[PDB]
Amino acid sequence: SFTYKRLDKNDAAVLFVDHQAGLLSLVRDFSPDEFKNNVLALADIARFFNLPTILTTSFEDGPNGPLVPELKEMFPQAPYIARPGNINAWDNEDFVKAVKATGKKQLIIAGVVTDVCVAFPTLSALEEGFDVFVVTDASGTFNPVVRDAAWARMTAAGAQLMNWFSVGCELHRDWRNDIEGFGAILGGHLPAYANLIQSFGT
Amino acid sequence: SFTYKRLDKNDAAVLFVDHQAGLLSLVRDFSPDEFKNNVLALADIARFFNLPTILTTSFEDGPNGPLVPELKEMFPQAPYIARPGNINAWDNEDFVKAVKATGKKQLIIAGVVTDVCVAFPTLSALEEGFDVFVVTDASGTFNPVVRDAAWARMTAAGAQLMNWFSVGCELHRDWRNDIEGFGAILGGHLPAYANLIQSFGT
Amino acid sequence: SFTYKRLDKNDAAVLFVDHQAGLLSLVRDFSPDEFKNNVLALADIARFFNLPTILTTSFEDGPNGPLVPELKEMFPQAPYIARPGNINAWDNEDFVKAVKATGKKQLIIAGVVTDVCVAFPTLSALEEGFDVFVVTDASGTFNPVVRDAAWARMTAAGAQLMNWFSVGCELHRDWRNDIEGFGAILGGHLPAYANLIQSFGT
Amino acid sequence: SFTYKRLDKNDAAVLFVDHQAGLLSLVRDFSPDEFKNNVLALADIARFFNLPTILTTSFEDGPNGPLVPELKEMFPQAPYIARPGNINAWDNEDFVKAVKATGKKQLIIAGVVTDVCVAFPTLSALEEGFDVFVVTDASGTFNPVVRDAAWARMTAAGAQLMNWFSVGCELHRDWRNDIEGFGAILGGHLPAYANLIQSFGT
Amino acid sequence: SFTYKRLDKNDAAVLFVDHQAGLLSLVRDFSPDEFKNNVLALADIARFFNLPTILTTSFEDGPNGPLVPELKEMFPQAPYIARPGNINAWDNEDFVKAVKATGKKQLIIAGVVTDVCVAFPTLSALEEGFDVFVVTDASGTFNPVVRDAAWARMTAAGAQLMNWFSVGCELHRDWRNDIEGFGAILGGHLPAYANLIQSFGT
Amino acid sequence: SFTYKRLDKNDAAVLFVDHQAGLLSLVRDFSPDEFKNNVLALADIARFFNLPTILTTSFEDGPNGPLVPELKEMFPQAPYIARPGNINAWDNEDFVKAVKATGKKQLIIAGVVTDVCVAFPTLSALEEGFDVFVVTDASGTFNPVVRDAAWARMTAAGAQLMNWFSVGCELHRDWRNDIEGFGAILGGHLPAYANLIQSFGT
Amino acid sequence: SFTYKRLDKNDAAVLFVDHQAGLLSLVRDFSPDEFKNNVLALADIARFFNLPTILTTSFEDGPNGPLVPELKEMFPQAPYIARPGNINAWDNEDFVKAVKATGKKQLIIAGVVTDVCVAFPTLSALEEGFDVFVVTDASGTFNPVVRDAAWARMTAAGAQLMNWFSVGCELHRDWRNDIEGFGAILGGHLPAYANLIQSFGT
Amino acid sequence: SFTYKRLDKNDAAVLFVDHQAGLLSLVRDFSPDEFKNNVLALADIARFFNLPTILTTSFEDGPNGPLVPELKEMFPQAPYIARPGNINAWDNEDFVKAVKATGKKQLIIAGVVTDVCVAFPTLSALEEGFDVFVVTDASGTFNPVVRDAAWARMTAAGAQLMNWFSVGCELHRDWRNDIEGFGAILGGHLPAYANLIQSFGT
Ligand SMILES: C[C@@H](O)CC[C@@H](C)O
Ligand SMILES: C[C@@H](O)CC[C@@H](C)O
Ligand SMILES: C[C@@H](O)CC[C@@H](C)O
Ligand SMILES: C[C@@H](O)CC[C@@H](C)O
Ligand SMILES: C[C@@H](O)CC[C@@H](C)O
Ligand SMILES: C[C@@H](O)CC[C@@H](C)O
Ligand SMILES: C[C@@H](O)CC[C@@H](C)O
Ligand SMILES: C[C@@H](O)CC[C@@H](C)O
Ligand SMILES: [Cl-]
Ligand SMILES: [Cl-]
Ligand SMILES: [Cl-]
Ligand SMILES: [Cl-]
Ligand SMILES: [Cl-]
Ligand SMILES: [Cl-]
Ligand SMILES: [Cl-]
Ligand SMILES: [Cl-]
């Protein structure tokens, strides 16, 4: 009938694909403020659950620009695959080697742009039998129309569309595993929730 | 072949998941006015057809805050499961125990937020063979994008996307079962329909 | 494999469901000017191809109000089923009686509201094996969210989502079948196309 | 399982359907500036990868108007099928004859309007076993609602929804195949990317 | 130099103009739920400060329909001027007599539609030297464009554009005048504020 | 002090400026359906109050195209000034001669595009001491941004921003002058008001 | 004659009015992410130019909640006026005393909500001859409509409408006064500008 | 007391302020495609009427980036003022010297961003008695809210808000001055108008 394949913190890896200084100016389907916070939220979550994290860039020594400094600072030890040519990250042998080295079946992916640098390796990974979870609000593209088309194409392939908050909650399962630690993530990336915490504290 | 598995007032139960004072401030994909009306509309419908109703909250003794007073006031005998830790309500044994105690195969679900507190138990219930009917306009989340992603994930699982008005009409089937009572629900939650009623009365 | 099941002018019937004066004030996902034009466009198309047309209303002697005068004036010989109680038109035996009396397998349907008076008989007709074509822009509801949920529910059942222009074009197949007649329909319901015709005529 | 059926520059043909001067005034779901740029972007891409290109128009000696001069100028040797009557291009034998003469199984299609001149031959081609790739941002129609319905109908048939940028990247595979040539396309149709290039050049 | 002409609860009167069941179906620049709540909010405020209130309708014995029952129920002794013909309420001598009988210099006005039934008497009252305060969110019309044009016309005439919340706060001046009474109004018409109250109460 | 300079049916003239078949394809800040209805509504009002009407076009024997047939058909005896070159209609001596020949102090103006063919003669007429009333929803332009700028420029000049409905009501003053005649206009151009009339008639 | 009265870093004071945990949940005309960034942006600017800063709250010991911790952390020596009752901060004698103690004629103001806690003291300050500069994107309210009404009221009174970025640039005047220092503010609150900086640095 | 001060091609100069590769990535209130077309349209117009043109940049040897090559290409003899520090271009003595050297009192201004690099010299120039005409659609900024605040501030100072099309038409006055030359500009920057020309040409 149906199988609920939900995120497991022991079976998941996170992929940050081409969050580069140049490419980010192409993102117009999210505001710069929301998009920065959403990506950093996913990064905090990846760091909080000690998930194997993989960083990759496309043509970073050109107009595409360098990876945002936050990602390198937060994951200084993570596999960093600079792709000089391959647009689909899965066409890069070093990238795929790094993914399989994690030993994780679940791939949490976010990047720029959604319709290409996210969609292409998502479709490729799905073909190889990976369970792919797309962080839709940490992935950006030219406009809502292009985004919706990318969703349709990935949905049809069996990708699970989610967001950083749902990713965090599905990984955490139970508040009591770490109340303050998890609460700090929510408070740090949901200003309305930070307000609830502060009011509750008085 | 396709089977129109529609709501039966003798086979349906209603689940209100985490409509709490704090969490409601996170809902931005509906205006506070429309969302309040939609939730209360579903509640009136649940009470009107005497459907087994289950109330549940998440970490209500924290920033998430208490359940809205209207729900506790309207359903004083309904099972009330306060979940101290489990984010997915289906991971709470008392919640599932209460759901199965109703003996209903059809689950009408609404809550906050859509992508988590609604989506997770929906996927879990669908996995167990339940027919899940999602009240999309009585469920709120951070923004339309997160909402649309939640829809995609629930749709792929076989969840039926509906709304409080369609839920009521599918339950009621025939106007003549109770013209005044059902009309009062419509008039009380559709101001435009209330206007039609008043004009017709003159 | 996929089969292009397209509209045939010898096998299609049109269903106008509850386009009533009162209920139309509930429609907010289309502007009153656009919605009136779209419905009348579908009507002109139904009449142009001499398609079997069925008119039905819900509780017309109440706040729901009478059928819009245009539909009755254009189809004075069409079966007119006033449903006193059944919300789903397919639960009315006389309505179903009229549909099957046409001998048409393809059902072109439009009405108010989309999530109920269109969705419910669409799902019912799909269950009995009918090919149902929904005229999405001649069907109205409370808001875009409710509409999108209704689309999702009908889509999963196998309904084909279309619009009055595509319905007309799929029925007509070839311009040369009636250049003057078909062009008059397009010009009469697409002001931009009327402008092209006038400019071309000088 | 799932198969990533991606565009191959050796197995793909591009179809420009009815981008005519008159019909373009019907397109309102894209701004005239963006739509012009998107169509021309797709054209540059088709020429860059030397893809078999087919131009077709509908009733061009009438109000529909002539094909835009750019398409005829850029593809002077491409098959040009002026369709006298058939609205669905696949109902035109000369058009289908030209498509099959390319020997390409992958069809990249764009045109006006989306719900008819794109949707109909897309569904027809899918029926014959072609892999159809729809350039959603190079296809225009009356409004977003009509667009979404067309997407739903084509998605249900197995069409792959894409955009000119993703189409180009999936065709190109690797930057190093032609850095200057491919970069010139991006800069020429993404003003933001042109800005990245100029800043990088200083 | 500038003079802050702010609302004074001893020098202000409230005018409810043509909030009738029929005319309300014309209001599309606000949703039915938000508009009802806003109008009732202004009514609660008017009653709370015991402000001289005037009710008026236009051609109520026709399609325009009766005044909403809430307004008559809340102000049973307030002057009720049924205007059989005059569109501008200020052209009705009984209406003007009632306005001046209050002896108030400040006129708080709301109604349907904004561009006519609000704008016209606003401009007329400003001409006679009244200080007119427009409750913009308790006044509805066909669309945002019509709204903005009406604002511009009233702005140029010297009308002060406000909303029910700002009207309430400017009248109240100080919380300590009546904390419970005023808080009940806010909580009863701001679902977000009611939630703050409930969380604070636990 | 402020003076309410309202429309008088004995002191007003209507100016239709460049509502031509070609130029109308430039109008994108209104949908083709609503814009057609609004212009025809203004036309009906001008004819209903027997107001001196002036029709003018710009370079009609070129791409701009002919005046829409409805306007000439409704006003066959009205002054028709085809402007060969002058973009500002007020720079055309025949146009100004016709305006002053009406002997009317109040100028009701609508046209295409708003920022030019409406704005320029509006400012010119305001300079000559005319009272100018702009029908904003019967005037179209490229986009909302351009429209708002045109509003700002005309507002600063002392132009009164209105719409066809408010224009009609300010001219009519009292329903009882002609209930049936005026009601027919409203019903004929407000699809929702037509519905109110039909329900009231039952 | 017009005088450009622009911000002077030696003659300006900054007012933060009621940016409280509870009241912030009422702000819906900005996303929580952009709004938090904008307020913190203004705070960094106030600190960067060492401007006299004044913090004030309204009924902080109730549902309104405490001031956001960032403001208190950044301005430990700033005047902190807790207003127990007065809604208009200018009706509070300690607040006005603190404002006049700065000796600054130019008031940069931001707060929650715009139509009340910002508008009221703005109008009051303008009455006392102060030059008031409104930071529109660091001020929040219920919805865009209420915001625009507040703008109209403050504009008509002579307030200068601005935003944190324009405020900063007008204070800074010249880049060379502190290139690195000012650039850090821009980079820290404009993610798009931070990207330009990083790309430029490689 | 109103004087229509319209653009004169013998008394006007054009100012392009900081249209730089870096700063353009900050513009989000216009799409990259529309904004590029709008700026280039203004440039073509400036060149067409041989208007004195002044180019200026802000900190171009930094993240702000170089001036777009098109402006530099079209005006190789125009005064080029690179401002190393002054944010307000009017604070640069070389810029003001160049403006006054043209001998033009009417200033046509466009740039990035609207609220700063356009607003500041606009306000300064108005102070010195210049007539300033703002090309609103050739000026970009962070978002519509920031845009509108800038409009309000410039409007209050007496700036005339326009757009490139209206600017061109007000300069051209009469079509017959140069039919083909002016028509080529319109056709080259209005795709909908280009379509009219092509259809008319057949
Ligand atoms: C916490 C967030 O909602 C606001 C914090 C800013 C205003 O300092
Ligand atoms: C929308 C309509 O029900 C308004 C109701 C009054 C009470 O505000
Ligand atoms: C009680 C109200 O403020 C919250 C809205 C709930 C009823 O959905
Ligand atoms: C065909 C239509 O766009 C013209 C009729 C209206 C503009 O008067
Ligand atoms: C008469 C009008 O208000 C209804 C619109 C269409 C459905 O007839
Ligand atoms: C710098 C900003 O544009 C993006 C930074 C986030 C994506 O880590
Ligand atoms: C490059 C693009 O973003 C705008 C600049 C034009 C004017 O060249
Ligand atoms: C819109 C037209 O004028 C330009 C041609 C584009 C569609 O290639
Ligand atoms: Cl590579
Ligand atoms: Cl639990
Ligand atoms: Cl029945
Ligand atoms: Cl053919
Ligand atoms: Cl009267
Ligand atoms: Cl002329
Ligand atoms: Cl106080
Ligand atoms: Cl300088």
Output the domain CATH number for residue E199: 3.40.50.850
Contacts of E57 in chain B (CB under 8 A): none
Chains that touch E (3 or more CB pairs under 8 A): A, B, C, F, G
Q: How long is chain F? A: 202
How close, in Å, is residue C35 to chain D by CA atoms? Answer: 12
Q: DSSP label at E105?
A: S
Q: What is the spatial distance between Cα C38 and Cα C46, in angstroms, rounded to a whole number?
A: 12
Closest residue of chain E to F144, computed from CA coordinates: E145
* Domain carrying residue G162: 1-202
Tell me the pairing of strands A106-111 and F12-17: unpaired
Rounded distance between C-alpha atoms, residue H49 and residue H106, angstroms: 14
Interface check A155 vs H, CB under 8 A: no
C65, C68, C199 ranked by CB distance to F22: nearest: C199
Q: Which of G9, G11, G27 is nearest to G19 (CA)?
A: G27
Determine if residue A75 is left, alpha or beta; phi over 0 gives left, psi from -120 to 50 gives alpha, anything else beta.
beta
Inter-residue contact A136 to A162 (CB < 8 Å): yes
Residue indicated by tokens 């005829």: D72
Strand partners, B161: B134
| Closest residue of chain H to C201, computed from CA coordinates | H200
Between CA F112 and CA F24 the distance in angstroms is 7
Closest-CA residue, ligand 7 atom 5, reads H36
Name the residue with the closest Cα to ligand 4, atom 3. C191
Burial readout D95-132 (b: 16 or more C-beta within 10 A, e: otherwise): bbebbeebebebbbbbbbbbbbbbbbbbbbbbbeebbb
| Structural contact between residues H21 and H113, judged by C-beta atoms closer than 8 angstroms | no
Of A159, A116, A158, which is closest to residue A27 (Cα–Cα)? A116
Residue closest to H135 by CA, chosen among H37, H202, H2, H4: H37
Amino acid at B170: E
Chain D CB within 8 Å of residue G200 CB: yes
Other CB atoms within 10 Å distance of the CB of residue A181: 10
Q: What are the strands of the beta sheet with G131-135, ordered from one edge? A: G80-83, G53-58, G12-17, G106-111, G131-135, G160-162
CA–CA dist F74, C153 (Å, integer): 47
Among F25, F92, F115, F141, pick the best mutation site for testing chain H contact (most H Cβ within 10 A): F115
CA distance F153 to H163: 11
Calculate how far, in angstroms, residue B86's C-alpha sits from the geometric centre of ligand 10.
4
Helix (H, G, I), strand (E, B) or coil at E49: coil
Q: What is the DSSP string of E143-187?
A: -HHHHHHHHHHHHHHTPEEE-HHHHHHHHH-BGGG-HHHHHHHHH
CA of C6, closest CA in chain D: separation in Å? 9
Total domains in chain B come to 1
Nearest 5 degrees, angle CA C166-CA C171-CA C173?
95
The answer to whether E21 contacts B66, with C-beta atoms less than 8 Å apart, is no
CB B62 within 8 A of CB A200: yes
Distance separating alpha carbons of residues B128 and B109, to the nearest angstrom: 15
Do you find a cis peptide bond into E39, omega within 30 degrees of 0?
Answer: no
Ligand 4 interacting residues, C-beta cut-off 6 A:
C 191, 194-195; F 19, 24, 32, 35-36, 39-40, 68, 70
Q: Which residues of E85-96 are buried (b: 16+ CB within 10 A; e: fewer)?
A: ebbbbbbbeebb
Rounded distance between C-alpha atoms, residue C55 and residue E77, angstroms: 48
Euclidean distance between CA atoms A200 and G21, whole angstroms: 10
Positions of E strands within chain A: 12-17, 53-58, 80-83, 106-111, 131-135, 160-162
User: If phi over 0 gives left and psi between -120 and 50 gives alpha, with beta otherwise, what is residue B47?
Assistant: alpha
C-alpha closest to that of C112 among G103, B192, A67: B192
Question: Does residue H70's CB lie within 6 angstroms of at least one atom of ligand 7?
Answer: yes
Residue B191 corresponds to which amino acid? P
Closest Cα partner for E190 from G144, B185, A199, B31?
A: B31
- For residue E172, give the amino acid letter: H
Under 8 Å between Cβ of C77 and C46 = no
For chain C, the first-to-last Cα distance in angstroms comes to 49
Phi, psi for residue D20 in degrees, rounded to 5? -105, 155
Per DSSP, C194 falls in state H
Between positions 94 and 113 of G, the ones with CB within 8 A of E are 113
Which are the contacts of G47, defined by CB distance < 8 A and separation ≥ 6?
G53, G74, G75
Q: Which atom of ligand 6 is nearest to the CA of A71?
A: 8
Q: Å from D85 to nearest chain A CA?
A: 31
Would an 8 Å CB–CB cutoff place D37 in contact with chain A?
no
- Nearest residue to C117 (alpha-carbon basis) of C106, C126, C127, C109: C109
Q: Which atom of ligand 3 is nearest to the CA of E190?
A: 3
For β-strands F53-58 and A80-83, DSSP reports them as unpaired
User: In the numeric block, which tokens belong to residue D49?
Assistant: 């990868």
Q: Environment class of residue A85 by beta-carbon count within 10 Å: exposed (0-12), middle (13-18) or buried (19+)? A: middle
CA D62 to chain centre: 23
| Cα–Cα distance for residue pair H112/H95, rounded to 1 Å | 16
| Nearest protein CA to atom 5 of ligand 2, as residue | E36
**What letter does residue E68 receive in the DSSP assignment?**
P
Buried b (16+ CB within 10 A) or exposed e, F52-87: bbbbbbbbbebbbbbbbeebeebbeebbbbbbeebb
Closest Cα to atom 3, ligand 8: which residue?
H191
Residue written as token pair 């009984």 = E94
Helix (H, G, I), strand (E, B) or coil at F201: helix
Cβ-based neighbour number of residue B82 at 10 Å: 16
Among candidate residues B7, B99, B117, B135, the one labeled active-site is B117
- Name the residue among D147, D188, D199, D180 with its Cα closest to residue D164: D188
Inter-chain CB pairs, E–F, below 8 Å: 93
Instruction: Give the number of other Cβ atoms within 10 Å of residue A12's Cβ.
Output: 22
Ligand 5 contact, C68 CB (< 6 A): yes
Query: What's phi and psi for C9, nearest 5 deg?
Result: -70, -10
Residue with tokens 């401007």: G51
Q: Which atom of ligand 5 is nearest to the CA of F190?
A: 3
Residues with CB under 6 Å of ligand 1 are A 191, 194-195; G 19, 24, 32, 36, 39-40, 68, 70
Classify E80 as helix, strand or coil.
strand
E196 contacts chain A (CB < 8 A): yes
User: Which atom of ligand 8 is nearest the CA belonging to H195?
Assistant: 3
Sign of CA dihedral F3, F8, F10, F13: positive
H29 touches H148 (CB < 8 A): no
Number of neighbouring beta carbons within 10 Å of residue E75: 18
| Alpha carbons B193 and B37: distance in angstroms, whole number | 14
- φ, ψ for residue G181 (rounded to 5)? -65, -45
CB C65 within 8 Å of CB C43: no
Q: What count of residues does chain E have? A: 202
G4-42 residues labelled b (16+ CB within 10 A) or e (exposed): bebbebeebbbbbbbbbbbbbbbbbbbbbbbbbbbbbbb
Most B CBs within 10 Å: which of C112, C116, C131, as the mutation test of the B interface?
A: C116
> What is the edge-to-edge ordering of all strands in the sheet holding A53-58?
A80-83, A53-58, A12-17, A106-111, A131-135, A160-162
3-state SS class at B14: strand
> Which stretch of DSSP H or E encloses residue D134?
strand D131-135
Q: Are G56 and G17 in contact (CB under 8 A)?
A: yes
Q: How far is the centre of ligand 6, averaged over its atoms, from the C-alpha of G191 (Å)? A: 6
F92: closest CA of chain C, how far (Å): 24
Q: Map tokens 């109040």 to a residue.
A: F106
Please state, in angstroms and rounded to a whole number, the distance separating the CA atoms of residues E31 and B184.
20
Cross-chain Cβ contact A146/D137 below 8 Å:
yes
Sign of torsion over alpha carbons G139, G140, G141, G143: positive
Q: State in Å: Cα C24 to ligand 5 middle.
A: 7
Give the number of residues written for chain D. Answer: 202
Say how far apart CA C49 and CA D14 lie, in whole Å: 34
Q: Rounded to a whole number, what is the distance in angstroms from the first to the last CA of chain G?
A: 49
Number of residues that make up chain G = 202
Resolution in A: 2.3
CA distance A141 to A118: 10
**Tokens in use for G133?**
């500069």
Q: Is the CB of D43 under 6 A from ligand 8?
A: no
C161 membership: H or E segment, kind and range: strand C160-162
Give yes or no: E169 in active site: no
Catalytic residue chosen out of the listed positions E7, E68, E117, E171: E117
Q: Please state, in angstroms and rounded to a whole number, the distance separating the CA atoms of residues C96 and H48.
A: 69
Probe residue for ligand 7, chosen from H14, H18, H24, H64 as the CB with the greatest number of ligand atoms within 8 Å: H24
Residue B55's alpha-carbon distances to B27, B70, B75, D179, H101, in angstroms, are: 19, 12, 8, 60, 77
Angle at E149 between CA F121 and CA H166, to 5 degrees: 35
Measured CA to CA, the distance from residue F139 to residue F116 in angstroms comes to 11
Q: From the candidates D24, D25, D33, which should be mutated to test the interface with F, based on the most F CB atoms within 10 A?
A: D25
G194 CA closest ligand 6 atom index: 1
Whether H15 contacts H56, CB under 8 Å: yes
* Rg of chain C on CA atoms, in Å: 16
Q: How far apart are CA A40 and CA A49, in angstroms?
A: 14
CA dihedral C18, C20, C23, C28 (to 10 degrees): 90
C113 cis-preceded (ω within 30 degrees of 0):
yes
Query: Is residue D118 within 8 Å of residue D142, measured between CB atoms?
Result: no
Strand ranges across the sheet with D106-111:
D80-83, D53-58, D12-17, D106-111, D131-135, D160-162
Give the burial class of B97: count Cβ atoms within 10 A of its Cβ; 0-12 exposed, 13-18 middle, 19 or more buried: exposed
Q: How far apart are the first and last CA of chain B?
A: 49
In 3D space, the residue among F140, F148, F160, F166 whose CA is nearest the CA of residue F41 turns out to be: F166
Q: What residue has token string 């792919």?
A: A132
Burial of C180 (0-12, 13-18, 19+ CB in 10 A): exposed
Number of CB pairs, chain A paired with chain E, less than 8 A apart: 5
Tracing tokens 């009906």 back to the chain, one arrives at F44
What's the start-to-end Cα distance of chain E, in Å? 49
Residue E66 CB less than 6 A away from ligand 2: no
> SS3 for H161?
strand
**CA distances from residue E185 to E32, G38, G58 in whole angstroms, order as listed:** 20, 31, 17
Q: Hey, how many other C-beta atoms are within 10 angstroms of the C-beta on A179?
A: 14
Cα-to-centroid distance, A35 and ligand 6 (Å) = 7
Query: Rounded CA gap, A84 and A61, in Å?
Result: 8
**Catalytic pick among G54, G117, G150, G186:** G117
- CA B37 to chain CA centroid, Å, is 12
Could you give the angle at which helices H32-48 and H164-172 cross, rounded to 10 degrees? 20
CA-nearest of G153, G157, G155, G114 to G24 is G114
